[PDB]
């Protein structure tokens, strides 16, 4: 009958079937392009890991990515010479979170004035842009993209 | 009517009822998940809350969170004796902006090569990291992680 | 009938095309849409990209790409001439798209010792140099500041 029709539609529009309503919880598959603003007031969450490590010479780098952008905070205590322009060979960033391009991390060491910069190239083979230096904490926080 | 039935039901499908659509201003409650991949073409807005406060010794760090990210900006001018390693007691960070893990923010001194850091720890009773100074221009802009 | 004409159209809509979002296919999607409660998105997430560089001035190379209102930087370059303390970059301006609606100061370091910088983009997008006078050495730093 018209009637079972126009029910089992209506039960579309509420909720369930194929389409995507203005309240429940759902899963929607595609890929969705949205052409004008969109907001969001609750939470926005996209795929996250996290890695922490020691590169080299005592310094420390927590990585958390969250899609294609790596949050980072460097952390440790210089434990023994690193020289100027050098390798940090202890580990390498994993290659899930090396950038496409080399990018300079700008940090600061506790108690005066001085910055450093370790670079994270693609390879994950890090380096350290300082001065010889065998003593002090590293410290900076940010962000750099993977893409 | 049927066509009455159908035609409310066409309607309900091409704007308003409970339905999402590919036109229109529409607000969507629920927990939407995309398991593919989603692009946006305009503005992808966020919650947003701004604070500025002088932290001690004429610093002034200006925040605003954007979600789980808060954009950071340290400014003022230095108009007391800020000591080596100390607490920054004039202002805390609001727990709003207070991050789980402290976090370390570099800055650069306007004039010279110095720079510094400000770290905001979990309590919101930020820290300086640069020496001992009673004068100068403190910058750096930057993201730091809520969570 | 005209009953079938109508559903039909109903149904066709019900379940791929029309103006309906559906909770498959590949679909564009129009108008300001307000997610009122928690979104998840298990794919990519992509904004708004546009990339520019250019050599501000003595040497210095400024790289940023914009993403929504977001814009990455990454300093590069050489000072290759006599850049005086708190002076304007006047080789190229940071274009008015990538210029933010506030001040920032993109703190950066010198290869090879403990010396550090900033530059400030200003809304002009005339960027000013904020370390001391100078006129040699590597500048590096990668960062964000926002457009709004």
Chains 1, 2 share one sequence.
């Not at 795929?47 to 927590?62: Q, V």
């Amino acid at each position: 009958t018209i009637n079972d029709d126009l029910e089992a539609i209506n039960s579309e529009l509420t909720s369930g079937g194929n389409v995507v309503h203005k309240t429940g919880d759902e899963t929607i598959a595609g890929k969705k392009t949205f052409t004008g603003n969109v907001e969001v007031n609750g939470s926005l969450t996209l795929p996250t890991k996290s890695w922490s490590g020691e590169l080299g010479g005592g310094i420390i780098l927590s990585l958390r990515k969250k899609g294609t952008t790596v949050e980072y905070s460097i952390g440790g205590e210089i434990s023994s010479s690193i020289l100027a322009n050098s390798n940090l060979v202890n580990r390498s960033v994993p290659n899930e979170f090396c950038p496409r391009n080399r990018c300079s991390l700008v940090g600061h060491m506790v108690g005066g004035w001085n910055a450093f910069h370790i670079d994270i190239p693609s390879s994950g083979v890090c380096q350290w842009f300082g001065p010889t230096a065998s003593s002090g904490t590293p410290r900076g926080t940010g962000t750099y993209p993977i893409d």
